[PDB]
Structure 1
Amino acid sequence: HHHHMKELIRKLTEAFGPSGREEEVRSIILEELEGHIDGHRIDGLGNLIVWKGSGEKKVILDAHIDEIGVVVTNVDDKGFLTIEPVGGVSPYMLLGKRIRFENGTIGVVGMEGETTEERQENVRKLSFDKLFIDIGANSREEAQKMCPIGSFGVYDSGFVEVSGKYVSKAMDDRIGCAVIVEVFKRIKPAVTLYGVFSVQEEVGLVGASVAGYGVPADEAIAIDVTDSADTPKAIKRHAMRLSGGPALKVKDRASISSKRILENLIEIAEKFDIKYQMEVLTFGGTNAMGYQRTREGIPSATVSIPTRYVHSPSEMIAPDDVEATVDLLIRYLGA
């Protein structure tokens, strides 16, 4: 390795930050960036925006700070919790897992069903309303004091090295957050660089990303994860893979200016022998509204870290891909 990002990745991935409660992650980001940013602000949606540099061109790098999890929606007479999903969490991934709550309380996920046929019927068509969380309470009253309705939880799973790979919860998108932090620590920007550590935008709600988080940027580059389809039988040509480098794309039907960002990233990677992969463009439909949506706003591209087991408690990345991503961005955004 040529960066020293392990501890940053451990800290960010282990931090508590389900959608709606990301205070710890923002605080960690600001501590890591102390002395490396010229300023910051937090918008009314909870997006953290930082900046460094004074160059003519304004560039956003945007990674999501929120993670998948659960929210408590009911407490029963014996102290058991009902939950709903926060983000894309499959109930299959939650079965038998331990969940850590904001206040440090640990709970165990169980499933309803007594007989084999009951459990078989349930587990074969698993629904969140068949799950519950046991926090060791013996009554509604004990449980409501520890995890009242509206409490968030995340996986009780942290960071581990798995023969040269890194595994943790919340690679999506704490790994993107780590990339941006590392870029801010290392770069002497030729641009005015904005780092946005954003809350994800629920479908059906107004988000801030289209308006550039109020930053009048010339370019916006999302730093995300993409599924690494290099596991057994999910073996196709042109798949994203671990150790293939950052995955580069734009949206389908992107503007000339957005495509230029992609071409320029490709050129940097080629000139500096940085591994990279060409990802299929983000699908956005085929209608007239979708066409006009890409031709307004800020020219944009996406750079993604290949990740196995996305949305599990054991998301896996190759540290070389992360370092390559940092290197690519520093070369692109530097002198």
Structure 2
Amino acid sequence: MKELIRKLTEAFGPSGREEEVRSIILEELEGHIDGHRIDGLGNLIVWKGSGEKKVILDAHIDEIGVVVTNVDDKGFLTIEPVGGVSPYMLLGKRIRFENGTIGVVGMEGETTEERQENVRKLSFDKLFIDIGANSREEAQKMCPIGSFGVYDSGFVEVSGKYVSKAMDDRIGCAVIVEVFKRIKPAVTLYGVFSVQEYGVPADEAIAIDVTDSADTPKAIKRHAMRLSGGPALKVKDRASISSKRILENLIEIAEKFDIKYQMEVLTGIPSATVSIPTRYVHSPSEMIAPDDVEATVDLLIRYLGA
């Protein structure tokens, strides 16, 4: 799965501009699916198998980023966050735009005191992006207002862990692709790669997401999700009887096929959530353990295969 994860996480796909992610998913899936369609909103749906039960696997394809909301007379860009990007995560970072344009995030403030003041309550209105332009007209030609940017960081192996941008939720997309690549389905299996800001009848829906891995220094919460603890199965409070049955089925599959799993504890179509534990979510260096990803693929193949 290494190369699949590299391609999906490094692909450009902020909200509304996910064409490259869809193309990679379809290229990886060719020869492994029976059909596909892209609805009016941009959701990619694929399907395989013919069993009587219909099951949806859903992961979202958007990644967090920024959107340009203004350009000044010297060509510097003003931005707002798209998704959960913290302004502290952007200081000194490079941002990649759709056409390959790279920008540098700076912070306002000339004196050392003003900068110390701005970082103590850092706000997006104190940030700007420098794309190397010298005027508004130069910047507009490169990066018009309304342009989306993403982290300019890529995939790297860190002593057996995988680190990239957009593990949330490209790792969920990767799991679904790998399931379709390997499975001999006992159900009719739909893969929904949603834009998340469907037209398919189904009996069950399983969302493949990420959850925060709380195993870094000074984490003292019991029942914390951790890397290499396996897929995290989500406990729901207001869940219907049918939703809780999906969860119990997955637990039974895990124990019967000897797959490690962990329970993510409480704080229309029946549904369950399976999550990949991830460190540093919403940073340019989200980190997963490949054995958790492989266990999640195995879990789904054994639950849905025959």
TM-score range, shorter chain: over 0.9
The answer on whether the counterparts of 2:235 and 2:263 sit within 8 Å (CA) in structure 1 is: no
C-alpha distance in structure 1 between counterparts of 2:237 and 2:109, whole Å: 45
Could you report, residue by residue, the CA deviation over 1:214-235 in whole angstroms, capped at 9, with x for unpaired residues? 1111000000000000000023
The answer on whether the counterparts of 2:11 and 2:21 sit within 8 Å (CA) in structure 1 is: yes
Residues 110-129 of structure 1: matches in 2 within 5 Å?
A: 110-129=106-125
Q: Report the Cα offset of residue 14 of structure 1.
A: 0.2
Secondary structure of the corresponding residue to residue 282 of structure 2: coil
Could you report, residue by residue, the CA deviation over 1:309-333 in whole angstroms, capped at 9, with x for unpaired residues? 0000000000000000000000000
The counterpart of 2:175, out of the listed 179, 196, 206, is 179
**Map of 2:271 onto structure 1:** 300
Q: Report the Cα offset of residue 43 of structure 1.
A: 1.6
Is 1:227 the counterpart of 2:212? The answer is: yes
The answer on whether the counterparts of 1:167 and 1:315 sit within 8 Å (CA) in structure 2 is: yes
The answer on whether the counterparts of 2:33 and 2:180 sit within 8 Å (CA) in structure 1 is: yes
Could you report, residue by residue, the CA deviation over 1:260-290 in whole angstroms, capped at 9, with x for unpaired residues? 0000000000011100000014xxxxxxxxx
Could you report, residue by residue, the CA deviation over 1:232-253 in whole angstroms, capped at 9, with x for unpaired residues? 0023210000000000014321
C-alpha distance in structure 1 between counterparts of 2:237 and 2:158, whole Å: 36
Q: Report the Cα offset of residue 142 of structure 1.
A: 0.6
C-alpha distance in structure 2 between counterparts of 1:198 and 1:137, whole Å: 35
The answer on whether the counterparts of 2:214 and 2:225 sit within 8 Å (CA) in structure 1 is: yes
Could you report, residue by residue, the CA deviation over 1:65-112 in whole angstroms, capped at 9, with x for unpaired residues? 000001111110000000011111001101100000000000000010
C-alpha distance in structure 2 between counterparts of 1:49 and 1:253, whole Å: 28
C-alpha distance in structure 2 between counterparts of 1:27 and 1:124, whole Å: 42
Q: Report the Cα offset of residue 117 of structure 1.
A: 2.1
**Map of 2:151 onto structure 1:** 155
**Map of 1:259 onto structure 2:** 244
**Map of 1:132 onto structure 2:** 128
The answer on whether the counterparts of 1:250 and 1:300 sit within 8 Å (CA) in structure 2 is: no
C-alpha distance in structure 2 between counterparts of 1:16 and 1:252, whole Å: 36
C-alpha distance in structure 2 between counterparts of 1:67 and 1:101, whole Å: 13
Q: Aligned-residue CA RMSD in angstroms?
A: 0.7
The answer on whether the counterparts of 1:135 and 1:143 sit within 8 Å (CA) in structure 2 is: yes
Q: Report the Cα offset of residue 180 of structure 1.
A: 0.2
- State percent identity of aligned pairs: 100
Q: Which deviates the most, 43-52 or 167-176?
A: 43-52
Q: Could you state the TM-score of these two structures normalised by the residue count of structure 1?
A: 0.90
**Over 6 Å off, 4+ runs:** none
C-alpha distance in structure 2 between counterparts of 1:90 and 1:44, whole Å: 31
Q: Report the Cα offset of residue 115 of structure 1.
A: 1.6
Number of aligned residue pairs: 304
C-alpha distance in structure 1 between counterparts of 2:199 and 2:260, whole Å: 33
The answer on whether the counterparts of 2:233 and 2:274 sit within 8 Å (CA) in structure 1 is: yes
**Map of 2:137 onto structure 1:** 141
C-alpha distance in structure 2 between counterparts of 1:316 and 1:334, whole Å: 29
Q: Which deviates the most, 312-321 or 227-236?
A: 227-236
The answer on whether the counterparts of 1:225 and 1:305 sit within 8 Å (CA) in structure 2 is: yes
Secondary structure of the corresponding residue to residue 301 of structure 1: strand
**Map of 2:77 onto structure 1:** 81
Q: Which deviates the most, 30-39 or 320-329?
A: 30-39
List alignment gaps of at least 5 residues for structure 2: none
Q: Report the Cα offset of residue 116 of structure 1.
A: 2.0
List alignment gaps of at least 5 residues for structure 1: 201-212, 282-296
C-alpha distance in structure 2 between counterparts of 1:117 and 1:280, whole Å: 44
C-alpha distance in structure 2 between counterparts of 1:46 and 1:129, whole Å: 31
C-alpha distance in structure 1 between counterparts of 2:16 and 2:123, whole Å: 23
C-alpha distance in structure 1 between counterparts of 2:213 and 2:34, whole Å: 36
**Map of 2:291 onto structure 1:** 320
Q: Could you state the TM-score of these two structures normalised by the residue count of structure 2?
A: 0.98
C-alpha distance in structure 2 between counterparts of 1:136 and 1:58, whole Å: 52
C-alpha distance in structure 2 between counterparts of 1:216 and 1:118, whole Å: 57
